[PDB]
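Is zinc ion placement plausible here? Inputs below.
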Amino acid sequence: FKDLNLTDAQKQQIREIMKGQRLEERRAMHDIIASDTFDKVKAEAQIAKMEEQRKANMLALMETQNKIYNILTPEQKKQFNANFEKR
Amino acid sequence: SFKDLNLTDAQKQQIREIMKGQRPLEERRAMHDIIASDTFDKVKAEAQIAKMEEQRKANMLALMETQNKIYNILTPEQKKQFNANFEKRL
Ligand SMILES: [Cl-]
Ligand SMILES: [Cl-]
Ligand SMILES: [Zn+2]
Ligand SMILES: [Zn+2]
Ligand SMILES: [Zn+2]
Ligand SMILES: [Zn+2]
Ligand SMILES: [Zn+2]
Ligand SMILES: [Zn+2]
Ligand SMILES: [Zn+2]
Ligand SMILES: [Zn+2]
Ligand SMILES: [Zn+2]
Ligand SMILES: [Zn+2]
Ligand SMILES: [Zn+2]
Ligand SMILES: [Zn+2]
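Reply from A.M.:
I modeled the complex. Tokens:
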């Protein structure tokens, strides 16, 4: 949600930023959870594998937000930053 | 949804015992710095993302072990319900 007063040109720019963005993991988790015994080495392997997808996801998320920040006016950026503190 | 499984009295005590270990904004502030810049610095971002790898590992190991311990006190009918629920979850 946004109390930023986005102009229609800005909302268009944003929608375009989002579209430019563009289970196996959970399955492995499931097997760790459902096992008779807890296998720490196997869990560590799954955690490490998960770091790769987290990296990809956090990079897309940050880049997207940065792109949005930089189409805002100075007044809109203040509000964005204030909102960021509140989450 | 472990609460959703009609836990027996004994299971609630066992969980209580298990859930004993079972146990941060500086990362947020760094994210904020990356986002509110007039360029996106992928190298700085990558470093930010990597910084709490060890803490993430420790926390996830604890969570996975705890969830494995709880799964194993379940009855066969409770396990079926847990697994079916699992197949529908983010
Ligand atoms: Cl699954
Ligand atoms: Cl099965
Ligand atoms: Zn266009
Ligand atoms: Zn599954
Ligand atoms: Zn499997
Ligand atoms: Zn078995
Ligand atoms: Zn070992
Ligand atoms: Zn990579
Ligand atoms: Zn006990
Ligand atoms: Zn600080
Ligand atoms: Zn500059
Ligand atoms: Zn590392
Ligand atoms: Zn688990
Ligand atoms: Zn299955």
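Short version: The two ends of chain A are 12 Å apart (CA to CA).
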